[PDB]
Amino acid sequence: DKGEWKLKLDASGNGQAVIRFLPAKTDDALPFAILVNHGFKKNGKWYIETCSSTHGDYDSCPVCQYISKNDLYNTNKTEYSQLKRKTSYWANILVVKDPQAPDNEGKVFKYRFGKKIWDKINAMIAVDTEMGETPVDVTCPWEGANFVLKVKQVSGFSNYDESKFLNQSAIPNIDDESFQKELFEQMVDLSEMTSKDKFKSFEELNTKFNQVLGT
Ligand SMILES: [Zn+2]
Numbered sequence: 001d002k003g004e005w006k007l008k009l010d011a012s013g014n015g016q017a018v019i020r021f022l023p024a025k026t027d028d029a030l031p032f033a034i035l036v037n038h039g040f041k042k043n044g045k046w047y048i049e050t051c052s053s054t055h056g057d058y059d060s061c062p063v064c065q066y067i068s069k070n071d072l073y074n075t076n077k078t079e080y081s082q083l084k085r086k087t088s089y090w091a092n093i094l095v096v097k098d099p100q101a102p103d104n105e106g107k108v109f110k111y112r113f114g115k116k117i118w119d120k121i122n123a124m125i126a127v128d129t130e131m132g133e134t135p136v137d138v139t140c141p142w143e144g145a146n147f148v149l150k151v152k153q154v155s156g157f158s159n160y161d162e163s164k165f166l167n168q169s170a171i172p173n174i175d176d177e178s179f180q181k182e183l184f185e186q187m188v189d190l191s192e193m194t195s196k197d198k199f200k201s202f203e204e205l206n207t208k209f210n211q212v213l214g215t
Contacts, residue, residue, distance in 0.1 A: 005109030008100035013153035018097035108186035
């Protein structure tokens with residue numbers, strides 16, 4: 001009821017589903033949105049904000065400024081790991097199979113994910129064409145491929161190692177214009193996730209950052 005789809009886990013902490021990453025909503029759009037941010041707690045307070053480096057602006061981020069000016073990477077590894085920028089991704093997807101919530105099947109939602117899954121998408125296209133490997137754009141409605149989402153609790157964390165892409169396949173009914181029109185219709189504007197309004201001014205961030213660090 002918000003537009004975002006999530007994999008629902010069981011008591012054991014297991015989850016599986018089949019999703020289909022969708023292509024760019026428009027010709028000048030991208031199938032993925034890249035977002036960077038910071039998230040850490042200090043003095044009983046949380047600093048959870050987007051990082052202006054998402055669009056190459058490190059100056060407008062107080063954390064990056066702090067990390068850099070204090071050479072934390074070299075003077076305090078620990079602190080560095082806690083405060084370092086974190087990259088995630090957004091995409092539009094078509095839920096194929098969702099055992100835990102069958103009502104999602106056949107619908108389009110925005111889906112967020114990390115490097116572990118992003119690499120699987122890229123490993124499909126960044127192949128060795130010198131050895132004859134066939135690249136595959138998994139987001140193509142005709143020659144893309146469904147992705148099986150598998151989660152398992154490993155060492156207390158959600159592990160996605162078993163997630164993988166299946167064989168290439170065209171989306172069913174994709175040739176039907178009405179279906180195709182509705183599919184792209186339900187896709188949300190991914191650039192919206194990285195627009196200017198998603199970043200607070202430097203002064204506001206710095207103010208919050210300082211209260212979190214106690215300055
Ligand atoms: Zn930053």
